Design a binder for this molecule. Structure first.
Ligand SMILES: CNC(=O)[C@@H](Cc1ccc(Cl)cc1)N(C)C(=O)C[C@H]1CCCN1C(=O)c1cncc2ccccc12
Ligand SMILES: CNC(=O)[C@@H](Cc1ccc(Cl)cc1)N(C)C(=O)C[C@H]1CCCN1C(=O)c1cncc2ccccc12
Lengths: 303, 303
């Protein structure tokens, strides 16, 4: 029993984290085989972070300008390349701790574990979701750039996020490991701001199924709704549309609890219209949207 | 910016986890130097879990009855000992991945990271608090026994919890690594139940300081209170008494925000008497009590 924000064990990623220093700037890099991946903004001075030309800044650098440290061990840079918003530093040593890995780009509404790192040293691990507006509600301070987000499938680390920057509302923006930003954000100081966000409806429904599996049933009702009528309510409360594909993804949790998806939709409609009336679900007084159907199945009992 | 339930990186503990099998029962063990620590209830059949005599059950066992596996590698048991509610299995191989470690017992209100394990394989990491009633609101299924709780200070793993059992309300009970239960619980099937619980007042105040550091200020007021008058309100709402020692522990967060502790106590009194009026603090619609002052300083900006 119980239900927590549960990260993947971080060991396989801790062994890949390094310190990257260029001039006065230090941040984190990801060391896989003989390549160190880090945010390209490591090559910026400070005054030129308003409108940098990164192609001009990189051509002015040589391998010796980059200091890479795996704990105490110095990794000599033998090549440098820009790929979109990431730097690829070829090093003389293949990481002996390189896990089986993939670079995957995630969808808004998908979750991942973040290993927050400072000076190439892991400090903590937490769960995050990619918001519909392509921001993440992370926990990051000065020096956290190059911290990575990941999922683990069997022995294989699927890297999905590298941390680049903070937006004015205190939410975070970054790239996939191919250096392509999530969302309409750029790696320079502008007036850029998080767009309007919505609540991830399929995740709220997954979390109500987690609650039922864990014995919170007070929000259940005899009523059902149509998908169309539910989506009218979703639109009114700034919730994402629910698709038939979402209804199918909730099939296993529906089967396990014996609560039809459209019956659970009727419960969510009542929670949106009425609130909780001072009650809680899985120790929350609000409708939680950062657990996927996968996260619920991963963590919850099979009975 | 931001504020998450942040666990310690789990790598140092992942390398210590093993599978322990005795007859038909499999659970997890902790492999440090040449000793594997696990719950003594691994030696129970099933019928005799109502009123086991563990001294009688253990004297009937030999080293060959215990199968210990570190992944694929078989660890031959060369000795067995009972220490309170834990079994100490001496093995022929010292764990080459043994971190610097201590066995520490924690206080109610203290937090720790849990590495949830099944069949000696880590599945996930999350933050927990020791409740005032000496239960933990964990997330554990069949086979999770021997999962451990820990804190990390520099390079040193402070092990504080081993998982033994679930109580009827779905909360969890276990021991320190010397095998001494937290709270009035026993490792056998009885009618035992979690005692009445209270809210950890010093942690709620730490979390309000985290909110102010992160720019949630709506709950602040010009008012102050006395420690005595606050503690009358605390008693009414089933909150733990606040001591002068707690006020001193909140000194650094008070200094950083410029909000006197007794001013923050006046804010908490108003939140208890009025509620939030449909507003949120650090993305919660309730008063969070599983962040210590240490957790807030560990995670939050120093400015
Ligand atoms: C409100 N912040 C901003 O608007 C933007 C502006 C900007 C955008 C893109 C670039 Cl490339 C540079 C500047 N700023 C200042 C950052 O993102 C700081 C980032 C990028 C440069 C290092 N850096 C960080 O170490 C950093 C990362 N995570 C959270 C933080 C919280 C506190 C302090 C620093 C951080
Ligand atoms: C409601 N549960 C109970 O009352 C008690 C009774 C009891 C107390 C002490 C002992 Cl030594 C044995 C039985 N039970 C059945 C457990 O704690 C199960 C524990 C102890 C024996 C294995 N075990 C688990 O693998 C287990 C652990 N964590 C959460 C679980 C959730 C689901 C299933 C199993 C677990």
């Amino acid at each position: 029993s119980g239900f927590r924000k549960m990260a993947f064990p971080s060991g396989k990623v801790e062994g890949c984290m390094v310190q990257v220093t260029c001039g006065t700037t230090t941040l984190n890099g990801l060391w896989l085989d003989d390549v160190v991946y880090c945010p390209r903004h490591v090559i910026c001075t400070s005054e030129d972070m308003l409108n940098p030309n990164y192609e001009d800044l990189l051509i002015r650098k040589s391998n010796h300008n980059f200091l890479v440290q795996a704990g105490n061990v110095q990794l000599r840079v033998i090549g440098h390349s820009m790929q979109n918003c990431v730097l690829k530093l070829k090093v003389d040593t293949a990481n002996p701790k390189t896990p089986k890995y993939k670079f995957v780009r995630i969808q808004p509404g998908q979750t991942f574990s973040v290993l927050a790192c400072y000076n190439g040293s892991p400090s903590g691990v937490y769960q995050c979701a990619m918001r519909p507006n392509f921001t993440i509600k992370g926990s990051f301070l000065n020096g956290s750039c190059g911290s990575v987000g990941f999922n683990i499938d069997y022995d294989c680390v699927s890297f999905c996020y590298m941390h680049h920057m903070e937006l004015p509302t205190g939410v975070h923006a970054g790239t996939d490991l191919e250096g392509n930003f999530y969302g309409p954000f750029v790696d320079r100081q502008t007036a850029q701001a998080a767009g309007t966000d919505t609540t991830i409806t399929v995740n709220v429904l997954a979390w109500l199924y987690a609650a039922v599996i864990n014995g919170d049933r007070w929000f259940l009702n005899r009523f059902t709704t149509t998908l169309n009528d539910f989506n009218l309510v979703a639109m009114k409360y700034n919730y994402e549309p629910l698709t038939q594909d979402h209804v199918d993804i909730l099939g296993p949790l529906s089967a396990q609890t014996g609560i039809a998806v459209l019956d659970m939709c009727a419960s969510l409609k009542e929670l949106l219209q009425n609130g909780m009336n001072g009650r809680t679900i899985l120790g929350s007084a609000l409708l939680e949207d950062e657990f996927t159907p996968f996260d619920v199945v991963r963590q919850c009992s099979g009975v």
